[PDB]
Design a protein around this ligand. Sequence first.
Ligand SMILES: [Mg+2]
Ligand SMILES: [Mg+2]
Ligand SMILES: [Mg+2]
Ligand SMILES: [Mg+2]
Length: 754
Amino acid sequence: MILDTDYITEDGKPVIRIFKKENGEFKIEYDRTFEPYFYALLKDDSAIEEVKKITAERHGTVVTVKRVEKVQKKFLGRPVEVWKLYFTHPQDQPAIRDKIREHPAVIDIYEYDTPFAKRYLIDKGLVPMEGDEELKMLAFAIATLYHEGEEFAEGPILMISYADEEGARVITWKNVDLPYVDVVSTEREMIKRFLRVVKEKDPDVLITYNGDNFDFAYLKKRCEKLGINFALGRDGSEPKIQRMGDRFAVEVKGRIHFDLYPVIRRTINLPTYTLEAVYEAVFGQPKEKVYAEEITTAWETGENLERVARYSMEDAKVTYELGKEFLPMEAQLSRLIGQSLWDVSRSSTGNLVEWFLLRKAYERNELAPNKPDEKELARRRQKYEVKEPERGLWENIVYLDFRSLYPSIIITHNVSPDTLNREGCGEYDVAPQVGHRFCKDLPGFIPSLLGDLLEERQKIKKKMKATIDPIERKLLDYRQRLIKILANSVYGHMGFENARWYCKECAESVTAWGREYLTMTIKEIEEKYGFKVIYSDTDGFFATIPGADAETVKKKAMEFLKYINAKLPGALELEYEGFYKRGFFVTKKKYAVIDEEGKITTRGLEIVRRDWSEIAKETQARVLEALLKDGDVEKAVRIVKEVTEKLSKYEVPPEKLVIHKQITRDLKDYKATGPHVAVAKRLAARGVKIRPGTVISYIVLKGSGRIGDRAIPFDEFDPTKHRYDAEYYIEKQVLPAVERILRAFGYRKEDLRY
DNA sequence: ACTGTGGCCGTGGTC
DNA sequence: GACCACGGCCACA
Ligand SMILES: [Mg+2]
Ligand SMILES: [Mg+2]
Ligand SMILES: [Mg+2]
Ligand SMILES: [Mg+2]
């Protein structure tokens, strides 16, 4: 199994290293014969000699074209003759590529900015993370001594914690009597102890959380201060800082630094991304947070240091658990993209798509088109630009959707930049409305690879059902799901402004075909099957037979699938997603349906909005049940009049009136002072410490004037000298919760209260 | 350019 | 009345 590749330099020449793990053994393969290159397209094939003589300067040396060779690659669908230019060293290219491009006889240059070690992976057809190899993993965290006004890492590192399958431990230079704590003399001997542990365990993977920006940079600054060779690399090197945009990232040679933060940040969407919040979201169990000022106070007074020891241990432990949870998916992703786990764990699929396409382009000898320049990226920028669902309560609803609508469209009509308006074909498909014509004589680049992807995904869903190993099944699943994402990302790439295979005509052709096939499918189910489509968005629809039992709907639906799938061209295929006993649809992307087993599902309808109070969420839930499990609209509206009256009589437990709002920043950085902010500023003066991330649990008291002036914290609430604002919780919590739901039923806000 | 972007919204509060 | 800061949805894996 290939972990990664880099290169070093021996006497000015590049030496590819290939870090590998085979049969549980770590190996470094050296390749001293791989040559950097890029392509050039010339006005006349005779001007090659003058191009060979183009020189530049890097450092105190002359940059020369080592050698050239004439090759034939596909470009815009047809074979072309281009000159493959070779050089001595990777770093030669950025110094001479502009001189070759500025040459008059050179029309353009291609594939000139490919990182040398990633180029090696593609040309040699190597795939990271492929094989059986069980990777050894170890996670680690640090706890430091902060003081406001100090430079970064000016204070020492207090504790270092690690965690693996053998447990979680902490190393520190103050005596803490706990069985998972090892005590050393100094911060120096602590960092040295950590280095020994890592060398001893020899992990393939080091897992951090924000290690790219905090942990390694702190360990670095302390190691330079204390003169420690922080030789975490398997080749004796120190961790290496790479800059990815304004972002910083850290690699450890021979291992994989898996920083969880960039992976979590694009897989789940949370208000803030603390380790504790992420562990909560992923595993449901809580994690206590000890703050910088608390850790500093504890270290200085020696009090409650065991609490900081447990927090350090927990940081490591949950980071190892998060690592075991999220690495296999990312490993499958890198195997699919054909790039390193280090790389794919730090980039969005919209950008990983180009690496996948670029590998496909090499596999099929297709000259990759260049990324756009500034003027071109300007012309590609275009401004952002469906019938409202049917009102009422609907019963016996089925949802039918298209299997990979946009990918199937690309494959069925051979949509691709290299097929758009290709002259001299005998068969074209014409896109509705936008009129673009795509050749059908030869398969296109994008459709051909999208076909292999969709076919692969189908094979893997079959092998999934024929696998008893739950580990193997889970990895197959990850692969199948990522394929679906990658195919859609390939469609999206065709519309991306910075995309190499950009093609606006291809993209708007695909949406045009999508609208045509969707409206067609709806017209067929209503006209020839008596269905009524209730709701539709892009690639699926809800529908039922008006006035029909459940079985008649389900059976007649499966018949429509046989009918429409036969009528549909090519890879266009409709499928059956689910049945729903009842459901109502408010507006686009806002609806509620109930599964026969009772499980209710909702689209953006607010149900966990923490912005809201328990009294409002409760009423919303009860209204949904009376609407979907009971079908009584009047029972729902009765519930609303019951709760609004119970609030007005001060008969609702104040505990259900607490509004939990998160403070996002420092109070000094708040321009508009809202109700939770006004409580936070009031608490800060009384002596409390508020900080970015604190939660304010407040209640609104009865009064005129600003809401913030009547808001007190709930632990400050006394039911005998405080009266809550019943009108506020009626008109601005419960009624706004249920108004949009019951406006689709013709009930106006004035019909829901007292 | 996922300690960022894009789209839709709403509300508390100056001025 | 007019406008803004600041949050909540849905995407971006
Ligand atoms: Mg290029
Ligand atoms: Mg720690
Ligand atoms: Mg760092
Ligand atoms: Mg190539």
